[PDB]
Amino acid sequence: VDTEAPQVKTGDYVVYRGESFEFYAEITDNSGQVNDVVVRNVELDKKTSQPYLTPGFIKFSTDNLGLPGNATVQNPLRTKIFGTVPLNEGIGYYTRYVVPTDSNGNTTRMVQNDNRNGLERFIITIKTQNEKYNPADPAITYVNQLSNLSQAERDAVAAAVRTANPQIPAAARITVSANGTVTITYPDSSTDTIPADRVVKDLAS
Ligand SMILES: [Ca+2]
Ligand SMILES: [Co+2]
């Protein structure tokens, strides 16, 4: 009789506010068949005494559930853990559980122990949006006075930064100070800076 639960491999997951993500847990069972997979908090929801998963932005799906041979060591079952992080999501980390059930009623046991991290237990770390990008230097804007850029010069720098950084979000804001220092404000309000020496130079005749 099958008394062995499915085994799971996950990882150490990093996600970023305002950005989408997807990870795949790998699941196998000695019987070769997994009937269900739930990604969940270890504790039940106070409001329903039923399983749940917080933060609410974490979603999951598993194709090919309940079919013979869907979870063998050779061809594992894969559970996708995906979503988009809200711009105001709390910065920090969580440990959550991938909990499959095989064809014989055996369910992987949730065990709160760091030695299970990366197996059925996984860490997900939520970082600010600026941590996903590394702003590129723009083409130099040449200005009449390095201590006092005009509005049009500040406007040209921002356009140059935008041109040099197509990979940053369209909703990221580029502001330029009076000495040409660039601030990039991402949609989640975190920031990056490009120092003036890589942005502006004095205009020669
Ligand atoms: Ca089994
Ligand atoms: Co001059």
Author numbering: 256 to 460
From the manuscript:
Many streptococci adhere to protein-attached carbohydrates expressed on cell surfaces using Siglec-like binding regions (SLBRs). Siglec-like binding regions (SLBRs) are among the streptococcal adhesive modules that bind sialoglycans. SLBRs contain two adjacent modules: a Siglec domain, which shares some features with mammalian Siglecs, and a Unique domain13 with no close homologs outside of the family. The conserved sialic acid-recognition motif governs general specificity while sequence diversity in surrounding loop regions allows the SLBR to select between related sialoglycans.
Although these three SLBRs are >80% identical in amino acid sequence, when they were tested with arrays containing 49 sialoglycans, they exhibited distinct binding profiles. In comparison, SLBRUB10712 and SLBRSK678 were more narrowly selective, although both bound to multiple sialoglycan ligands. Specifically, SLBRUB10712 bound strongly to 3’-sialyl-N-acetyllactosamine (3’sLn; Neu5Acα2-3Galβ1-4GlcNAcβ, Fig. 1b) and a small range of related structures, while SLBRSK678 bound to only two of the glycans on this array, 3’sLn and 6-O-sulfo-sialyl Lewis X (6S-sLeX; Neu5Acα2-3Galβ1-4(Fucα1-3)GlcNAc6Sβ, Fig. 1c). To reveal how similar SLBRs could include or exclude different sialoglycans, we determined crystal structures of these five SLBRs at resolutions between 1.0 Å and 1.7 Å. All three of these variants exhibited a substantial increase in binding for 6S-sLeX.
